[PDB]
Amino acid sequence: MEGVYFNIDNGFIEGVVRGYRNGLLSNNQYINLTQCDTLEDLKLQLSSTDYGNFLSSVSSESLTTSLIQEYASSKLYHEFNYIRDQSSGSTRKFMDYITYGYMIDNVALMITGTIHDRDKGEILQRCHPLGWFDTLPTLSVATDLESLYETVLVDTPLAPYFKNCFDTAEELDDMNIEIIRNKLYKAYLEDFYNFVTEEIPEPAKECMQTLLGFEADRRSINIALNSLQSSDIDPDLKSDLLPNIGKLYPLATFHLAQAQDFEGVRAALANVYEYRGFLETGNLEDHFYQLEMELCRDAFTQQFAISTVWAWMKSKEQEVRNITWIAECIAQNQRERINNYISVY
Template sequence: MEGLFFNVDFGYIEGLVRGYRNGLLTQAQYANLTQCDTLDDLKLQLSSTDYGNFLANVPSPLSTSIIQEKASSKLYDQFNYIRNQSVEPLAKFMDYITYGYMIDNVALMITGTIHERDRSEILERCHPLGWFDTLPALSVATDIDSLYTSVLIDTPLAPYFKDCLSADDLDDLNIEIIRNTLYKAYLEDFYEFTQRELPYPANETMKTLLEFEADRRSINIALNSFELELSTEDKMKLLPQFGKLYPAGITMLASAEDFEQIRSVVETVIDYRGFFDNLNGDKTLEDHFYQLEMELCADAFCQQFTVSTIWAWVKSREQEVRNITWLAECIAQNQKERINNYICVN
């Protein structure tokens, strides 16, 4: 029934996103890019794609960082254009997408500050989609309380901070704990929003995509916490309480004491089987996650009358930028034998 009225508010945006998605690099275009011998060759090949003349005003010599920056800027411009056209509940959905980048920016600013790095340099590294007006003021925070009361209380992240105020000092470990606690609260809130506010099939598609995101974070946290003095209870506070691994798998991940225990838990989910095989080869665990994410995003575009295609498009474009950056690095470092180790998007 919702499909009858979907196009009234969201038809233009869905058409726009599907058009953007059709502009993703094809396998033939990737094949041409892998044949490039210099970054200028790469620039020429990209000019015949939807990226067009995005490097036209960049002075020589080209660098990988400039190519990544300019490719990312195209995504940010398109995202902000969609955001400016949206109405509720899509406008709130677009806001939720930016919250994850806000959390990363907060962690980056605090980490840079405690290590006395130049503020302008830190701000340049902040993600554009996670920018908020009081972000530069984070550099004056010296403890959790001042961080919250002077800066974050007026941002959308404020509700997620209620479980982060127990840390005493702003050191590297506590900042990472804060970041993961914030992300857990954010993902759970986003998940609840999509199930409550989005109509079918958007809610079902986002359920699948966000469950994958929650499981990926849980697995990575479990793997990275072996050398930290965190109890099972402490770990449980960092792991999202939903996903295909929830509830039994999450509990076992929090109490796992070695790699094999984590592996046995993860492989109870059929979608994740084989992820830990041959990790010393060309594919890393993160590569397996990226590959599955692209498959889920491709499936999301098989549905009609759904705003979940926006999330799928953003993730697909981010992977495409990673692919272009990888190709550029292989060319710049003369590592052509590894140039085909990118993640297929289409």
């Protein structure tokens, strides 16, 4: 069974990630964060959690929402780098595959900032330090997508993902880069799905398959809801952006590819059972965040599985997003919508 040969390499990693998991904030702790008046009260209230002595040795007057999200993200990133250093074999590969999806976002961000003639150092910060890949600041030269690819991208692990991206052969603007990036992330999700299907053991295999299914479905609905802006897009030129994985591909990405208005997307999602609860109500992004957190919560019930790393990563990112939203509502005196955090624990 699954508990037999797992611990030999991954028992220490699994125990440490469960110990990280036990420090996730519950509902009462978020309510205590909501009841803070100033920002120093928020610092003192966060000090009595797993975070504590993280804003020690900063200041009492240089405390800012941006500084709090920087340090709360850096703690996450150092913990992930520790767990990635303590692994080998298939787990090391799996965590590198977690890193590549942020590498794609850094590629798109650096190219987009290079188009608008911004500084190298401005784009080098706010550029998500986990997806680094050493030859990243060299993407600020030589605007043409080929003269990026034949020079620096072939030696990166993102090299097998540009097999579709060489159709247009001109200088780039803001819509071409997004078409490129969507093709990247499509090929990426299908590479990582076929990785999980063949090497990861079974109770982690099914959990990672359903989590990747939700990632593909969320990005399919986002591309279908963003592609009906002011352009003309062939359904043949749009169905190369929706991934061939998920519970809405065998036939429901077809009606997303052939859709003109918002009602076409509503009628496309009307037959998939988990969906069509989303478009007839308010903030459409919070439904994806809530369903992702419920799936990640369901991933913590399997014990001998390395789906725990992915589930804890996404849960801790949602936790940082919640603390940033609460800190914004405290610092700007906008307490009307402070209870819109997403807490499942």
